[PDB]
Ligand binder design. Structure first.
Ligand SMILES: *Cc1c(COP(=O)(O)O)cnc(C)c1O
Ligand SMILES: *Cc1c(COP(=O)(O)O)cnc(C)c1O
Ligand SMILES: [Mg+2]
Ligand SMILES: [Mg+2]
Lengths: 464, 462
């Protein structure tokens, strides 16, 4: 009946392989009770015990096919062995890690050289951070410090991260709603609208523009035919920096090492994260022209102005170096294109048999599927009560659209053990974002399950 | 040429085993040439080949003693083997990593329960992020959304990170000046000042206050005798959240598992990072009261509003758990205290022997050391006089920057010891070693510091 010591408590926690229920209890208590209740509600409250390649294994050992791939940080799949080996070996060699501001980091130097030479444009500099949002802040500050102007234009339905800097150029109200006011001088331009973008970019206080090659968390929209290039030229016209967020489209995901390659876009600043981790170690990178970095920070007061405690550690860089390598050795760029074209075709063929399935969009292995579905006593209710009931019912109607889409998510997980999800900005687009190592066998299996699910929901909408 | 394929290029870089001179070049070119040039200057432009414990080693095997410790993320030293083992083992077991938003992560779950058990106050939730600045940023967001008020008070000379949100509450101008304007409704309040504080805390605009238990980049100042406990009760008085950044002071650095302990502070929101990585894997943590989280996020629309791709991955959590375990298992908090007291004393003995060394401050192993033709001019245009005066002065300050820095160079070049100067202040040398430091290592450094102290007195005659 006497209490354990701290250490014994901790020892007993670390060492235990806990029951799934106890893990579910623990999250619920100490992390996010709504998240738990939600997955339980969607009947996808999984506890994964192991992972390899395209598979996640639960606590009973059952396998799941992972089309989320950690929202895009798993291009190489779960636990890729060469990346794993690279990491292990570095540690065995007692390589130094977090020493990048007290000495010159050997491995980070390697990655910087590599990234710049592979990057599009004329990148000469890199700052290393630990995440997407952080890599975005880094670009933001470069824009600010080199131009001296505090403004940045962004496009509606952009997603650039959730730190408040990044949030200020994130074109989606559901994410920004609660944190007003954000930063002044950022400008939302409607998407694909170029005359409007001339207006925004002429503005005295605007130094830069931030775009994504394809908007991801904004429902997988490839820009129109001439847009990105026009944007590029317009930015040259106006003296504005072109800043390209490739945290999501980068590293072979759209069928090119960089999505920029599709339209010959030459950024002034570029942002990488997600899969640069090798799905192992958090990492971000921000590349820019050497001469911009010069205007930003090439002064004795300025050269350490932006810095990061973890950012640029040798370890992460060892990992990334190895991740990149594997993307290249395994022809995953080519696979993404090829398998990507195949998947899209195949899905489209199912989607043009179902009116609720509207469209299949994307490039390489970045895809989304869009759905599209759906007296006196009253006279003498107060107007307030009537207005309130009207509005609820309105908003409910729309939510009924996303509930339909989540119905897909749930059936795939529950009936077919396939993990998919929905994008953060739109809740009406299923993301389809497999690891790039994905097989034809696996693709075809996804195609059939999805046909099964359309075939079932069509019949549920038929008993009405 | 022609040019090499992308693969063979990468493979060549990977395979190469570069000379120290090539790394520098490479870094000069692609990362930060000012930094590289700086280090040549200080004569501390090392490229380290391995590291273990308190030791860093170069191309040739030469040992340096590490008084910087990654700026506080290495309480356990370089490559602590239990932590390295846990990592390797989780990888060998094929543990899933970044699955925290598509499923329920088991290891992360554990870490959150532990941290809540160990945290002071009554912490009931945790959000995992990837760095210090990101955890603050998550503190700021909890504050904004639980209260609905956009403003946060902060203390002058505070340091909370370099992302834009955090920087809006970092009270140091050398860090903000280029990136104005920052976020609105954030009030800087002077440090030590209760009335300035109460004043600010009463604004209708302000929902929270943020503080460090010892200001890190502001010269290692233990706050005055009753201040923190008063702030806590001021925050209660006013219904303003108390938010404590223990990024630097947490995990044994000051001789208590959390520095809050020294003054029985009970935060509403607490931040953690740096040493939580065990020096391996970037990680951040933000803890709050559960009723706070409910207010901020406990709804259908709000429960996923704050999130992170990497944040809350199993791997980092495994590492963090292991490193916690080690701090506890090796009595490292007591060691910091005990070793800390001794180090402080020992440095005190020396500095009373010199007057350019004014003060030695800190608790445990968070320490700092403080330091201390007629007509021609006449007929110069006024602007000219005003520019040469302003410069001449600004140098005045700078001459004392260079004095400290000289001490750093000397420690490095002649004794192979690494130290630095705080990020906000330049006239304070940090002494912030891994908590595994030994009495002997401490003696070696005290001795070195004495040697240098003299050779800058002797040289401070002419
Ligand atoms: C995911 C994402 C980010 C932010 O990444 P985090 O790592 O979550 O910070 C930024 N930009 C884009 C385009 C993204 O997809
Ligand atoms: C270093 C530091 C931060 C920022 O940490 P990063 O991980 O470098 O972002 C925040 N708060 C305090 C008190 C710190 O010392
Ligand atoms: Mg259709
Ligand atoms: Mg003295």
């Amino acid at each position: 009946a006497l209490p354990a010591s701290r250490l014994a408590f901790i020892d007993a926690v670390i060492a235990q392989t806990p029951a799934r229920e106890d893990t579910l209890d623990r999250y619920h208590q100490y992390i996010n009770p709504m998240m738990v209740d939600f997955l339980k509600l969607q009947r996808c409250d999984n506890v994964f015990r192991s992972a390899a390649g395209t598979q996640l294994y639960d606590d009973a050992g059952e396998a799941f096919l992972d089309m989320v791939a950690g929202y895009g940080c798993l291009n190489l799949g779960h636990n890729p062995q060469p990346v794993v080996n690279a990491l292990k070996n570095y540690l065995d060699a007692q390589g130094p890690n977090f020493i990048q501001y007290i000495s010159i980091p050997e491995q980070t130097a390697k990655l910087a050289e590599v990234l710049c030479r592979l990057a599009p444009g004329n990148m000469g500099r890199v700052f290393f951070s630990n995440s997407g949002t952080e890599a975005v802040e880094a670009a933001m500050k470069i824009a600010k410090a080199s131009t001296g102007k505090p403004g940045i234009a962004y496009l509606r339905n952009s997603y650039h991260g959730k730190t408040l800097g990044a949030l200020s150029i994130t074109g989606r109200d559901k994410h920004r709603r609660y944190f007003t006011p954000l930063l002044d001088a950022m400008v939302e331009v409607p998407f694909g609208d170029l005359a409007a973008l001339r207006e925004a970019l002429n503005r005295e206080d605007v130094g830069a523009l931030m775009i994504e090659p394809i908007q991801g968390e904004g429902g997988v929209h490839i820009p129109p035919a001439g847009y990105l290039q026009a944007v590029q030229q317009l930015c040259r016209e106006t003296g504005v920096l072109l800043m390209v967020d490739e945290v999501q489209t980068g590293l072979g995901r759209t069928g090119k090492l960089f999505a920029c390659e599709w339209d010959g876009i030459e950024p002034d600043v570029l942002m990488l994260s997600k899969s640069l981790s090798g799905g192992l170690i958090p990492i971000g990178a921000t590349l820019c022209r050497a001469d911009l970095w010069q205007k930003a920070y090439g002064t004795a007061d300025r050269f350490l102005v932006h810095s990061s405690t973890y950012g640029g550690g040798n370890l992460a860089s060892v990992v990334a170096l190895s991740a990149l390598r594997e993307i290249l050795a395994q022809d995953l760029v080519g696979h993404a294109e090829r398998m990507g074209a195949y998947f899209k075709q195949a899905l489209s063929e199912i989607a043009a048999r179902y009116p609720f399935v509207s469209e299949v969009r994307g490039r390489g292995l970045m895809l989304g599927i869009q759905f599209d579905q759906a007296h006196t006593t009253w006279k003498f209710l107060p107007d307030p009560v009537q207005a309130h009931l009207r509005a609820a019912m309105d908003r409910m109607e729309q939510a009924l659209g996303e509930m339909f889409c989540m119905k897909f998510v749930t059936k795939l997980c529950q009936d077919h053990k396939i993990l998919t999800f929905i994008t953060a900005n739109s809740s009406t687009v299923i993301r389809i974002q497999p690891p790039l190592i994905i097989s034809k066998a696996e693709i075809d299996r996804f195609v059939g399950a999805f046909a099964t699910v359309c075939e079932e929901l069509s019949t549920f909408l038929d008993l009405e």
